[PDB]
Design a protein around this nucleic acid. Structure first.
Ligand SMILES: [Ca+2]
Ligand SMILES: [Ca+2]
Ligand SMILES: [Ca+2]
Ligand SMILES: [Ca+2]
Ligand SMILES: [Ca+2]
Ligand SMILES: [Ca+2]
Ligand SMILES: [Ca+2]
Ligand SMILES: [Ca+2]
Ligand SMILES: [Ca+2]
Ligand SMILES: [Ca+2]
Ligand SMILES: [Cl-]
Ligand SMILES: [Cl-]
Ligand SMILES: [Cl-]
Ligand SMILES: [Cl-]
Ligand SMILES: [Cl-]
Ligand SMILES: [Cl-]
Ligand SMILES: [Cl-]
Ligand SMILES: [Cl-]
Ligand SMILES: [Zn+2]
Ligand SMILES: [Zn+2]
Lengths: 124, 124
DNA sequence: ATGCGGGCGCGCCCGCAT
DNA sequence: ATGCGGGCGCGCCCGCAT
């Protein structure tokens, strides 16, 4: 079910973390997008094609402090998913959202875009 | 400050738990009663005299599920403090509140009485 | 049907760097 | 002044006993 989607997204991880951390991060994301068909499809299409064709926002609700907790660890959610699918060595203040992204973390919306192809890497 | 109150209440623990668990449980309780002078005085007087002279209710806010967490462990708050100051071997369904107790756990109020001398031990 | 009981995240907290 | 960052509790969840 969601397990087959998680496995397909797992195939595109960059190895910056353990298999078990990546699994928990992907499971957490897929569960939030379960009742949001359009956002889930935009995520699978963006990850599966390695952001070949422009994709739409993939959002989750922002926490009060901005960090998302996965398997006991807290990090910014857009950073967690960009590290996982694009830049395994990604550090803080190294992301810049694309002009068309309407729910980017920096835009201070209760909905945060975690589409890794909605961000580009910059020098800190 | 609250540390001197915690030490005086610690002297009356029955040893059912570790020194460190008892300390965390007492610290948590004292902190909640810090801005409730009358309730804190009723607690110190009841514990210090071993419930010699009738005491008034000592309440904390009830959680949605009824259990209080102290140092990673969950238990009913009236049970935690009765185990700590009166019955170290206390088990579930072995407590019965006194007729004058208005905030007893069984009375389903958002305020729970944790005065151990507001309960008496019964057979389960 | 109803509750226990334990895993784990978000909210609160607070010490610390800058 | 402002934010990081990690500890820990209450809320949510869910498997399980009864
Ligand atoms: Ca559990
Ligand atoms: Ca701190
Ligand atoms: Ca600190
Ligand atoms: Ca400081
Ligand atoms: Ca610091
Ligand atoms: Ca900490
Ligand atoms: Ca469960
Ligand atoms: Ca279970
Ligand atoms: Ca069952
Ligand atoms: Ca069970
Ligand atoms: Cl990874
Ligand atoms: Cl890891
Ligand atoms: Cl969400
Ligand atoms: Cl951003
Ligand atoms: Cl004890
Ligand atoms: Cl113990
Ligand atoms: Cl309280
Ligand atoms: Cl009761
Ligand atoms: Zn976006
Ligand atoms: Zn009472």
């Amino acid at each position: 079910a969601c397990l087959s989607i998680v496995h397909s997204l797992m195939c595109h991880r960059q190895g910056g973390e353990s298999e078990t951390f990546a699994k928990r991060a992907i499971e957490s994301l897929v569960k939030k997008l379960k009742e949001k068909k359009d956002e889930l499809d935009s995520l699978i299409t963006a990850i599966t094609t390695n952001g070949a064709h422009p994709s739409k926002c993939v959002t989750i609700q922002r926490t009060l402090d901005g960090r998302l907790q996965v398997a006991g660890r807290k990090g910014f959610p857009h950073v967690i998913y960009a590290r996982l699918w694009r830049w395994p060595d990604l550090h803080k203040n190294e992301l810049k959202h694309v002009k068309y992204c309407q729910y980017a973390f920096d835009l201070k919306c209760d909905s945060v875009c975690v589409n890794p192809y909605h961000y580009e890497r910059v020098v800190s």
